[PDB]
RNA sequence: UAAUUGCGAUAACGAACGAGACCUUAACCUACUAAAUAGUGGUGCUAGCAUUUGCUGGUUAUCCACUUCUUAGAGGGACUAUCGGUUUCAAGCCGAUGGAAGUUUGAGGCAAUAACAGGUCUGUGAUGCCCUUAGACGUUCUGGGCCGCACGCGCGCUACACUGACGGAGCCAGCGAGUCUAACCUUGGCCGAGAGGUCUUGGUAAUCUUGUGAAACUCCGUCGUGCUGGGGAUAGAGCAUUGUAAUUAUUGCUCUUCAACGAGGAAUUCCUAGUAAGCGCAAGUCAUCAGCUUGCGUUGAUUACGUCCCUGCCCUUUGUACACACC
């Protein structure tokens, strides 16, 4: 009979998971030459799929543009090449 | 509170007044002479006796 | 057949059983204490008391039937239990003997203060350092009360411990 | 009659016995080199005394450490204390006293707890409480 | 590592017996959200359909969905000794049968009405609303009406 | 000088041996896996259910190589863990005895793990050599 | 008469009792003494148990 | 010294550090000096510890509990918040990750960045209440540097945890962003907002 | 024969002195033996309620029983063992003989 | 001074009890004996690496001054050593090239002449008094009952989610616990996804549980600025056991369904050490499992020397018309 709470609205994240060719190559060309790259930064800015970002980072690091220096858990240190 | 009991205080006073020439300034030989000149039922008690003895002799030397 | 862990506790329980039985059944005869000695195929138990002849009785029938008592109780081998009696030295130095004497005096019916004076003079003639008796309960009063009589100084530490404190 | 020294690093409930010999400079813990200590963060902690003493003087000394009891941190700290005390014992037996004094000075300047035993063992449990010295509640109504 | 291509076939909304199915989430969690099937059922049907977990829900086929509903509605057909099923030794049939989304509520309420009509103590406690399996309503459990 | 798991690492060693045992395929897996929970304290079979039996075999082989006489109870105790038994506090629960026994018997049959005197399972000679070979392989690949 | 003890008294607190007061609560079976806690407190000094901590 | 040969690979970076100069894999833990009188005789300078998990006799004496190194202070400050309170094994890991990110960003010295942040977001004064009787009274003064750094770190972490409260995202990112916002001056941080409203009321009272 | 004479006492000083006289008698008889091995003294702890009923603060007591076990490995005939046991006798000391 | 413990003491001096004093689990007894329950140097036999010092493991008598991990004993300690600052330069409070620390060395036990009409003629076979001794208030049996719900109160447990649910993998605890008219403690196989027993070169007990493989860490993946994947609590079906009996689920398990919970408003609780707490073990009742109780393991941020406002206590001043003495 009582709610006992304000129960305001939430952020209501609308993170798109499907992307087109334009979005894909845009994010692929925007991730280089950037000094602010991480999972949280990508989520905040590009709002892209985390798994797609991870596989893209793995491909980019196996070919070699941005190198990972730490292989700890839940975080990897990425530094771009000059 | 670290100050000890009046019984052991009197024990130390009497030991000093009765065997002052025997004992010396050094604390270790103070223990190893008190253990043989005075019968004490506790090693801790004899340690406290010798500690206050050397403290009072230090006060005598400076004071 | 038994681990030593349970066996030590069992031996302690048997010693407590013998002590409690002897003090319960021998309160009138002035029981003081029991000691034991274990040897192959023989167990000697010695009763430290005052009236050795009286606890012996006539022809030792008391000790014979007490041995049979302990036998049929603890289910040992027949005839392997033997008890002797010994007169305690320094009889008044045990609180149990003093308590039994005061029980006897109360049964006789002399005054409580007279009995206190008598036990005080007896303990000082024996040579004990100090004593303290306490009578608690009703004594010619609707509600109970506790009165303590003390002689000398009695410490309250476990530095003398059971070694020097007798309760 | 080959050189052999037996030391022990102690902790709250962890004991690590160290056999120090003259070898090729390889350190074995639980029958294995300590390079697989696992967390990858405690390896640097173990290496800090070795880093400050340098590989030059520890070139021909091999230590075999058998640990038991305690926890991970307890065992690794006991290992470091054991290797330090075995090193000082080796210096006492054979190596220069001046070198022993300089290593002791460096160790004391860095951290006094490297050689000295961590003998601050915990207080026991207490009645009327859940922890060591904590009470539940003086409930009134 | 391995890569994956995303086509236009990705569908955000789906249907399952006139019930909305959430997209843009993992398949297993989608079936958990779907009534009558939980995490273990979702994992088992994923294994039976033989699809890698890394693949998203959009990269799924109509034949895969048909196979998943087939295994959902007929687990015993896949040569299972039938000990992973919720409804076993039912009185109405005596043979193990898989519960469905609305069929879970159906079977529960038929059990409820069976208890009511036999007038069992368990059934009367269920009808009254007080705990039947030994819990106490003495102290807590009253902010529920 | 000398090759052993004592010398080589473990983080990549376990994955390398898992891949090697996957390639060998001489484990004789049961078949009825991916439906059992593998432990009454476990409520969720692994995500990569396509394998992981090679991982468990490598783990038990390493355990019986470090030690020398282990048992099914020891295996259950090691592979057990905490259970979140509702509001009640956690507890320690073992693994599944039947699958443990079947994996032990499969290891005995293949010969990677042998029987030992006085009762127990022990690392076998062929298992010791292939462990050393894989250790050398990873220690040569990374270096 | 066999109808007096038809209900079993082989196990349980009905048989696991002390030998002093024949009570079935506050019993200790450790070291096989089977004694009540307060009677144990009374007779522990003579039994052998001593208070240290 | 001669290169010893063993099956165990001694890592290249630590080998180079041993040969030439003691440091981390890339992070140079030298030049840690600070000229501030608020930090003189209170910061471990030129006595670095590669690991901040120390078991020393600190609380036995008077102020060694406050004389323990700043990295250990950060570890203990992270070690709080109930369920998180404890677990020094991961406290050292999280402080190491924060050090790594604060070196990746601001290519200047990370400890210089951290002292800049401390001296920038440390609350400059505090008010204290006195009961007295009948009504509580306020009296405003300044505080000690240790209290300053403690309150600054506590407010920063509290803001980070309240921004990540009922959230499903990692905490290292928000800790790093709070630290960088405090260091540079952004007016959007929770702790910075509290500090600026506090200094508003302080300058009103002064 | 490899006999083991085992003492299962609680009296710490009594155990020490009986072991001392046994070992000194063995030394003066010049017969091979093993040293007196002491099993770690076992403490039997009883945590029981201070008060009979449920009055007052929750207070408990920990009764302790220290029991000392020790054994000496000897090799002597039955008559020599009996003479050894008879000599240096003390009540309460619990002795027992095993043969390996 | 976490004690009228003490320096100094106005009429006091001199003693007593409480206190102080009495002690291992909390070490380093490297003087000396100590586990077919121990070690490495090599000792007989072995799998793998170069026939480039040897390596881990094994059955136990197949070894050679020994105790470096654990017990003792006539006898060890650290007595706040020694110095620098403050006291008619009198107790003490602090900083410093070393032992286990120099806040009294850690926590506890035993324990103030007297009191409470505080708990127990209601788990005690201490027992006069009003109650029974032919349907007894004693005892015995079946089924109920401290197990019932509109309701309030405190102890305790689970949460508010990259720390945790997690899963497949590495490596770990000290005191102790365990079988005689009882066949007990889950050690390796068979009936068997597991739960009962079928064989005991494991148990009168450091070796069978057990050197307590759990409690916290490291490669990998989801909850990725949530009306739920944290929350197996909130229900039903089945798979299992001593017990001449478990239905209002004795307990575990395999599934299916998150009706609550976004640092939580006034009041209060416990805490300076390696302390509260992050989390699991041993024992009690036991037929089954505790969340209760008595004992350990990884670590803790900024006082510990500082006052009555509320939780209070004590001493002495002061005022009484009080003595089963403010009830």
Description:
The structure is cut from a larger assembly and holds 9 protein chains of 9 kinds. Chain B has helices spanning 6-18, 27-37, 43-61. By secondary structure, chain B is mainly alpha-helical. The longest helix of chain B has 19 residues, at 43-61. Chain B is globular, with a radius of gyration of 11 Å. Chain C has helices spanning 4-25, 52-56, 61-74, 95-108, 112-126, 161-164; strands spanning 31-39, 42-49, 81-87, 131-137, 145-151. Chain C is 44% helix and 23% strand. The two termini of chain C are 37 Å apart. Chain C is globular and about 55 Å long. By secondary structure, chain D is an alpha+beta fold. Chain D has 3 helices and 5 strands. Chain D has a 5-stranded mixed beta sheet. In chain D, strand 1 and strand 2 (14-22) form a beta hairpin. Chains in contact: A-E, A-H, C-G, C-I, D-F, D-H, D-I, E-F, F-H, G-I. Chain F binds one RNA strand of 327 nucleotides through helix 1, helix 2, helix 3, strand 1 and strand 2.
Summarize, please.
The structure is cut from a larger assembly and holds nine protein chains of nine kinds. Chain D is α+β, with helices and mostly antiparallel strands and 141 residues long.
Whole-Å distance between the termini of chain D? 76 Å
Helix content of chain A: 25-40%
- Neighbour order of strands in the largest sheet of chain D: 1-2-5-3-4
Main β-sheet of chain A: number of strands, strand sense, barrel status? 2 strands, antiparallel
Distance between the termini of chain A: 64 Å
Strand order of the largest sheet of chain A: 1-2
Number of domains of chain D: 1
Largest interface: D-H, 28 and 22 residues
Q: Order of helices and strands of chain A, N to C?
A: HHHEE
Instruction: Quote the beta fraction of chain D.
Output: 15-25%
Main beta sheet strand tally, sense and closure of chain D: 5 strands, mixed
Tally of separate helices of chain A: 3
Oligomer: part of a larger assembly
Q: What coarse outline of chain A follows from CA principal-axis ratios?
A: elongated
In total, the number of strands of chain D is 5
Helix content class of chain D? 25-40%
The DSSP helix count of chain D reads 3
Shape of chain D: elongated
Structural class of chain A: mainly alpha
What is the N-to-C order of secondary-structure elements of chain D (H for helix, E for strand)? EEEEHEHH
| Cα Rg of chain D | 19 Å
Cross-link (Glycyl lysine isopeptide (Lys-Gly) (interchain with G-Cter in ubiquitin)) (chain I): 2, 13, 82
Keywords (chain I): Acetylation, Cytoplasm, Isopeptide bond, Ribonucleoprotein, Ribosomal protein, Ubl conjugation
Subcellular location (chain I): Cytoplasm
Protein name (chain I): Small ribosomal subunit protein uS10
């Amino acid at each position: 009979k009582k709610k006992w709470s304000k129960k305001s609205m939430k952020d209501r994240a609308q993170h798109a998971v499907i992307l087109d060719q334009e979005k894909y190559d845009r994010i692929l060309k925007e991730v280089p030459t950037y000094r602010y790259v991480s999972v949280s930064v990508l989520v905040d800015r590009l709002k892209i799929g985390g798994s797609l970002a991870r596989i893209a980072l793995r491909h980019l690091e196996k070919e070699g543009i941005i190198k990972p220096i730490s292989k700890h858990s839940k975080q990897a240190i990425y530094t771009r090449a000059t | 509170g670290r100050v000890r009991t009046k019984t052991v205080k009197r024990a130390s006073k009497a030991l000093i007044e009765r065997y002052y020439p025997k004992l010396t300034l050094d604390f270790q030989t103070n223990k190893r002479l008190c253990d043989e000149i005075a019968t004490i039922q506790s090693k801790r008690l004899r340690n406290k006796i010798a500690g206050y003895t050397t403290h009072l002799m230090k006060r005598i030397q400076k004071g | 057949l038994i681990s030593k862990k349970r066996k030590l506790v069992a031996d302690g329980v048997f010693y407590a059983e013998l002590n409690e039985f002897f003090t319960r059944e021998l309160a009138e005869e002035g029981y003081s204490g029991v000691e034991v000695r274990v040897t192959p195929t023989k167990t000697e138990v010695i009763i430290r008391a005052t009236r050795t002849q009286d606890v012996l009785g006539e022809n030792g029938r008391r000790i014979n039937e007490l041995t049979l008592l302990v036998q049929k109780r603890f289910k040992y081998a027949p005839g392997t239990i033997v008890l002797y009696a010994e007169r305690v030295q320094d009889r008044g130095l045990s609180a149990v003997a003093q308590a039994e004497s005061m029980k006897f005096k109360l049964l006789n019916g002399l005054a409580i203060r007279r009995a206190a004076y008598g036990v005080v003079r007896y303990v000082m003639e024996s040579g004990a350092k100090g004593c303290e008796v306490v009578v608690s309960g009703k004594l010619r009063a609707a509600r109970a009360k506790a009165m303590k009589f003390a002689d000398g100084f009695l410490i309250h530490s476990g530095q003398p411990v059971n070694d020097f404190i007798d309760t | 009659a080959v050189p052999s020294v037996q030391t022990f690093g102690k902790k709250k409930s962890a004991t690590a016995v160290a056999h120090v010999k003259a070898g090729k400079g390889l350190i074995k813990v639980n029958g294995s080199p300590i390079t697989l200590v696992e967390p990858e963060i405690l390896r640097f902690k173990v290496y800090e005394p070795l880093l400050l003493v340098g590989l030059d003087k520890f070139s021909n000394i091999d230590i075999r450490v058998r640990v038991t009891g305690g926890g991970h941190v307890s065992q690794v700290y006991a290992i470091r204390q054991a290797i330090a005390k075995g090193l000082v014992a080796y210096h006492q037996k054979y190596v220069d006293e001046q070198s022993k004094n300089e290593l002791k000075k460096a160790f004391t300047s860095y951290d006094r707890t490297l050689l000295i035993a961590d003998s601050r063992r915990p207080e026991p449990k207490k009645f009327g409480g859940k922890g060591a010295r904590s009470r539940f509640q003086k409930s009134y109504r | 590592s391995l890569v994956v291509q995303e086509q236009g076939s990705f569908q955000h909304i789906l249907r399952l017996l006139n019930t909305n199915v959430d997209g843009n989430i993992k398949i297993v969690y989608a079936l958990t959200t779907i009534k009558g099937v939980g995490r273990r059922y979702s994992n088992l049907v994923c294994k039976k359909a033989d699809v890698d977990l890394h693949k998203r829900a959009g990269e799924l086929t109509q034949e895969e969905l048909e196979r998943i509903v087939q295994i959902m509605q007929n687990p015993t057909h896949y040569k299972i000794p039938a000990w992973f099923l919720n409804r076993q030794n039912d009185i109405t049939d005596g043979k193990d049968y898989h519960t469905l989304a609305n069929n879970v509520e159906s079977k529960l309420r038929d059990d409820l009405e069976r208890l009511k009509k036999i007038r069992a103590h368990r059934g009367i406690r269920h009808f009254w609303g007080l705990r039947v399996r030994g819990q106490h309503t003495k102290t807590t459990g009253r902010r529920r009406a | 000088p000398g090759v052993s798991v004592r010398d080589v690492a473990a983080q990549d060693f376990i994955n390398a041996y898992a891949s090697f045992l996957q390639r060998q395929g001489k484990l004789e897996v049961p078949g009825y896996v991916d439906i059992v929970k593998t432990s009454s304290g476990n409520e969720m079979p692994p995500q990569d259910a396509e394998g992981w039996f090679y991982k468990r075999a490598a783990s038990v082989a390493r355990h019986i190589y470090m030690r020398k006489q282990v048992g099914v109870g020891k295996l259950n105790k090691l592979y057990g863990g905490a259970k979140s038994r509702g509001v009640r506090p956690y507890k320690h629960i073992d693994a599944s005895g039947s699958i443990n026994r079947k994996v032990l018997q499969a290891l005995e049959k293949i010969g990677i793990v042998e029987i030992s005197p006085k009762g127990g399972r022990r690392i076998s000679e062929n298992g010791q050599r292939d462990l050393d070979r894989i250790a050398a392989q990873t220690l040569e690949e990374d270096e | 008469e066999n109808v007096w003890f038809s209900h079993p008294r082989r196990y349980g607190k009905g048989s696991r009792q002390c030998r002093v007061c024949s009570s079935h609560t506050g019993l200790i079976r450790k070291y096989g003494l089977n004694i009540c806690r307060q009677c144990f407190r009374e007779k522990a000094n003579d039994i052998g148990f001593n208070k240290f901590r | 010294f001669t290169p010893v040969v063993l099956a165990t690979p001694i890592p290249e970076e630590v080998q180079q550090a041993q040969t030439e100069i003691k440091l981390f894999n890339k992070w140079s833990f030298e030049e840690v000096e600070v000229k501030d009188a608020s930090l003189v005789d209170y910061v471990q300078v030129r006595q670095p510890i590669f690991v901040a998990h120390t078991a020393g006799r600190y609380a036995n004496k008077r102020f060694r509990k406050a004389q323990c190194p700043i990295i250990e202070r950060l570890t203990n400050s992270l070690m709080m918040n109930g369920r998180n309170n404890g677990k020094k094994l991961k406290a050292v890991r999280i402080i190491k990750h924060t050090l790594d990110i604060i070196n990746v960003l601001t290519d200047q010295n990370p400890i210089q960045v951290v002292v800049d942040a401390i001296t920038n977001t440390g609350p400059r004064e505090d008010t204290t209440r006195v009961g007295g009787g009948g009504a509580a009274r306020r009296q405003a003064v300044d505080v000690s540097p240790l209290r300053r750094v403690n309150q600054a770190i506590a407010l920063l972490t509290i803001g980070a945890r309240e921004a990540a409260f009922r959230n499903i995202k990692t905490i290292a990112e928000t800790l790093a962003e709070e630290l960088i916002n405090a260091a540079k001056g952004s007016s959007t941080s929770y702790a910075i907002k509290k500090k600026d409203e506090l200094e508003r009321v302080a300058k009103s009272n002064r | 024969i490899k006999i083991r004479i085992t003492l299962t006492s609680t009296k710490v000083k009594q155990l020490e002195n009986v072991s001392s006289n046994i070992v000194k008698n063995a030394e003066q008889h010049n017969l091979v033996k093993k040293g007196p091995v002491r099993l770690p003294t076992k403490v039997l702890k009883i945590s029981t309620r201070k008060t009979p009923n449920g009055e007052g603060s929750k207070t408990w007591e920990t009764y302790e029983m220290r029991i000392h076990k020790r054994y000496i490995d000897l090799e002597a005939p039955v008559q020599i063992v009996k003479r050894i046991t008879q000599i240096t006798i003390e009540p309460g000391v619990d002795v027992e003989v095993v043969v390996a």
